Design a protein around this ligand. Structure first.
Ligand SMILES: *[B]([O])([O])C1=[C][C]=[C]C([N]C(=O)[C]I)=[C]1
Length: 359
C-alpha cells in the first residue's frame, strides 16, 4: 500500500506550502487504489482556535462549475435539453439579433463570443439581468473564441434546469447530491451545519462568499473534504453510478467539445491528455493564460471520455482556495481545500508532486 510512505508525501509537500504562502488550515484527500486518504492541517478558525476537519466546510469557488456541467449533463441524459438547441428556446425573451446563432453548448463552454468574466455588481434582479444580456455585444463570432466567464456558464445552468420545473438548488440536490450520497454539500449551509463552516482569510482579515446573480451556478457550492473525495470517485470511475442519467451526465461532462491547443474543454471539467508535462499544466493555470481569449478548434462530433486524461479544475473565492485533479486511467486523484486564496500554479505544482509519487 505504501500508506506509510504515501502519508509522507502529503506532509513533505503541503507543510512547506502552508508556511511558504501563509496558509492557515488545509485539508487534503487522496484517492490511491480506490480508497480515500484524508489528511487535515492547520486551523478552520484561528480566531476561535478551531482546527480543520473532514467535516469542515470550505468554499469551492468555480469548482462548483463541475456540478453545473453534470447537472446540465444528466439533464441532457434525460433528453430535456440538447447541446445544440438555440438558447432562445429556453428563454425567448433574449430577442437581440446577436443571440440568434448562440447555442447551449456555447454558454456551456465560454464559446458564445466574449461574455464577461464577472456578472456586473450592478446586476441585482431578473430584469436588470435580462437587460445586460440583451444589450451585450460579442467581439468575436460564436464557436471561434474561448473566454472563461461566469456570465456564460451561469446562465447555461440557470436555463438548463428550466424544463425540470424545480429551481437550481432543488434539481441540483434531487438529481445529483442525494443519489451520489453527498449529504454534506451545500449551496446554503443549514444553521445546524454552520458550525462546520470555516472562515476564508484575505488581507489578514476574515471573509466568506457573498450573494450575487447566478452565484450557485458559478461559485455557490460549499462542502467538506470527505464529500469532495466521493465526488471525485464518482467522476473517475463512473461505471459504479447506480442511476442511468447521472452516469451518462458524468460521461457527457468529460466528453470533449473543443480543443484549446494543449487542453480540451468539457462540461465544467478541463482535460489534458495523459501523460502531460507538469510545466504544461502548471503554466496554463497562470491567470495570464486561464482568463485569456484564446481561439478554439472544435471536435465534431464530441469525443467521448478518454481514460488517459488529466481532468481537473481550479476554484477560488474571496478567502478560499481549492483544486482537484485525477488521472482516470491510473485510479488516482487528489483534493486540496484551503481557507485562503493563493496562486493557482502553486496549487497545481504541489499536486503533481504528490500525484506522480503514487506511480
Ligand atoms: B472561480 O474560478 O473561483 C471564480 C470565477 C469567477 C468569479 C468568481 N467569483 C466572483 O466573481 C465573486 I468572489 C469565482
Amino acid at each position: 500500500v505504501s500508506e506509510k510512505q504515501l502519508a509522507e508525501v502529503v506532509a513533505n509537500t503541503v507543510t512547506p506550502l502552508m508556511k511558504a504562502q501563509s496558509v492557515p488550515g488545509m485539508a487534503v484527500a487522496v484517492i490511491y487504489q480506490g480508497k480515500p486518504h484524508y489528511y487535515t492541517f492547520g486551523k478552520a478558525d484561528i480566531a476561535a482556535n478551531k482546527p480543520v476537519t473532514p467535516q469542515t466546510l470550505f468554499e469551492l469557488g468555480s469548482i462548483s462549475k463541475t456540478f453545473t456541467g453534470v447537472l446540465g449533463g444528466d439533464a441532457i441524459a434525460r433528453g430535456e435539453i440538447s447541446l445544440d438547441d438555440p438558447v432562445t428556446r429556453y428563454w425567448p425573451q433574449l430577442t437581440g439579433k446577436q443571440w440568434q446563432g448562440i447555442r447551449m453548448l456555447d454558454l456551456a463552454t465560454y464559446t458564445a463570443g466574449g461574455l464577461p468574466l464577472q456578472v456586473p455588481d450592478e446586476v441585482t434582479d431578473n430584469a436588470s439581468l435580462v437587460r445586460f444580456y440583451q444589450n451585450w455585444q460579442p467581439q468575436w463570432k460564436p464557436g471561434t473564441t474561448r473566454l472563461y466567464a461566469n456570465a456564460s456558464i451561469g446562465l447555461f445552468g440557470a436555463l438548463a434546469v428550466k424544463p425540470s420545473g424545480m429551481p437550481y438548488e432543488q434539481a441540483m440536490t434531487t438529481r445529483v447530491l442525494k443519489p451520489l450520497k453527498l449529504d454534506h454539500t451545500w449551496i446554503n449551509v443549514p444553521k445546524a451545519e454552520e458550525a462546520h463552516y470555516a472562515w476564508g482569510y484575505r488581507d489578514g482579515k476574515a471573509v466568506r462568499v457573498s450573494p450575487g446573480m447566478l452565484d450557485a451556478q458559478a461559485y455557490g457550492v460549499k462542502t467538506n473534504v470527505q464529500d469532495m473525495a466521493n465526488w471525485v470517485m464518482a467522476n473517475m470511475a463512473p461505471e459504479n453510478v447506480a442511476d442511468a442519467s447521472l452516469k451518462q451526465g458524468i460521461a457527457l461532462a468529460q466528453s470533449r467539445y473543443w480543443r484549446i491547443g494543449s487542453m480540451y474543454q468539457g462540461l465544467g471539467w478541463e482535460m489534458l491528455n495523459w501523460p502531460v508535462e507538469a510545466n504544461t499544466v502548471v503554466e496554463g493555470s497562470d491567470s495570464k493564460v486561464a482568463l485569456a481569449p484564446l481561439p478554439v478548434v472544435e471536435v465534431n462530433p464530441p469525443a467521448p471520455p478518454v481514460k488517459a486524461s488529466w481532468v481537473h479544475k481550479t476554484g477560488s473565492t474571496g478567502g478560499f482556495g481549492s483544486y482537484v485533479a485525477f488521472i482516470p486511467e491510473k485510479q488516482i486523484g487528489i483534493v486540496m481545500l484551503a481557507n485562503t486564496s493563493y496562486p493557482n500554479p502553486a496549487r497545481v505544482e504541489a499536486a503533481y508532486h504528490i500525484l506522480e509519487a503514487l506511480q
